[PDB]
């Protein structure tokens, strides 16, 4: 929501300025907004010709007279009792979402209390209307979802999530609840879910901990502390072992070098030499020196390191991992290198794996659709279609059914 004010000089068109206005104290467009907003700009009218004005601006002044807290009619009158030469102060109100490459965008005509009310309708309905719940939650941003929950708490004294927990079930429930959770909560939850088995969901732990950034991980680490009264680092230690533990615990610190300004070419060469020397060039492997280079260095640096590695090593980094280590450690390294090299491709391959064969690994599918829909889902779809020849939408369509399917399809954003 970036706000910039501006003046615009219009010469009245044939029959008027060429736009429609809405709002007023007695006609609030969104709750608690008496502002006067342009709704339509006429097709081939004077307003379109000057351009500047945009379907959505807030009118604050007409010929110097302010539009704050007016009834609809008084604002209309100011326009109709004006000259043919009209100058107005507008506030352009562009809003930008976190990533440009997420699929779920913040809804432009957002009203927290209104949304909350229709959801209550869909809950307070015989059979419950699972469709309208999906239609608003998957089209609202995560932060918009927060505000929905807050207004829901207010209107019911019950919170949004535990009303959907009673009114939803199956795979559909998982998705909706996951979207209700902030990115830190959801990740913290999937993480607590991973370790609460003693045998532990290594593949999921590897997925989150290899793919989250410093910013995300530090947020997880704090919220993890708040939800389960343990340090996440402590749980990792208690449910892993060997160099896998060292690799995981080092990543989960979220203390990787942030992308500096200058490119350290000397260090790129040194790191490449050391990865070669520590591994394929030597009998056995120096795992700790792998762990240090791959956890400590920034992502752009490591991408470049992996290319320089090919200058020295007859195999590339992934191929070198497969021939030096096995088990969870091999797994963690292959996943970490994929995330460093192409994270959207990483996720597109995990999604394909979760659907390619019999049944569906629903936990991996849901998790990715929820946690990447506002990050890089569009890059994920582009890599998916390029590699697999059919869209992500299509695979979701072939593997999932019902309202659950339509929910995943919305988080996908569309076909390709």
């Amino acid at each position: 929501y970036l706000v910039t004010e501006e003046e615009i000089n219009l010469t009245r068109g044939p029959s008027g300025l060429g736009f429609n206005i809405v709002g007023g104290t007695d006609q609030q467009y969104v709750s608690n907004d008496s502002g006067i907003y342009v709704s339509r700009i006429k097709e081939n009218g004077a307003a379109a010709l000057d351009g500047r004005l945009q379907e959505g601006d807030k009118i604050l002044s007409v010929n110097g007279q302010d539009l704050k807290n007016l009834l609809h009619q008084d604002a209309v009158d100011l326009f109709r009792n004006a000259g043919y030469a009209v100058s107005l102060r507008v506030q352009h109100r562009l809003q930008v979402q976190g990533s440009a490459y997420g699929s779920v965008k913040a809804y432009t005509n957002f009203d927290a209390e209104r949304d909350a009310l229709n959801i209550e309708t869909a809950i307070k309905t015989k059979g419950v209307d699972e469709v309208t719940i999906v239609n608003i939650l998957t089209n609202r941003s995560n932060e918009q979802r927060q505000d929905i929950a807050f207004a829901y708490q207010r209107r019911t004294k019950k919170e949004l999530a535990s009303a959907l927990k009673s009114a939803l079930s199956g795979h559909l429930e998982t998705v909706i609840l996951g979207l209700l959770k902030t990115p830190a909560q959801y990740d913290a939850s999937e993480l607590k879910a991973s370790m609460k088995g003693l045998g532990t969901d290594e593949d999921s732990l590897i997925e989150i901990i290899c793919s989250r950034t410093n910013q995300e991980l530090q947020e997880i680490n704090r919220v993890y502390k708040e939800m389960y009264k343990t340090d996440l680092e402590k749980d990792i230690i208690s449910d892993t072992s060997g160099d896998f533990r060292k690799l995981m615990v080092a990543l989960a610190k979220g203390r990787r070098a942030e992308d500096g300004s200058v490119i350290d070419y000397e260090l790129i060469d040194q790191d490449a030499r050391d990865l070669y020397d520590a591994g394929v060039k030597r009998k056995g492997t120096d795992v700790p020196k792998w762990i240090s280079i791959m956890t400590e260095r920034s992502v752009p640096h490591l991408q470049k390191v992996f290319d320089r590695y090919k200058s020295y090593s007859p195999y590339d980094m992934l191929e070198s991992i497969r021939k030096e280590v096995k088990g969870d450690l091999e797994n963690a390294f292959l996943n970490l290198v994929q995330c460093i090299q192409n994270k959207p491709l990483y996720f597109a391959d995990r999604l394909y794996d979760s659907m390619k064969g019999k049944g569906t690994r629903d936990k991996v599918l849901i998790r990715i659709m929820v946690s990447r829909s506002e990050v890089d889902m569009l890059k994920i779809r582009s890599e998916f279609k390029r590699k697999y020849g059919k869209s992500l939408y299509y695979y979701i369509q072939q593997d999932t059914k019902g309202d659950y399917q339509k929910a995943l399809l919305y988080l996908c954003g569309g076909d390709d």
Binding site: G16, F19, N20, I21, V22, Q27, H72, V76
Partner: peptide, 5 residues
């Protein structure tokens, strides 16, 4: 609600 201007 909407008003041409």
């Amino acid at each position: 609600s909407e008003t041409s201007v």
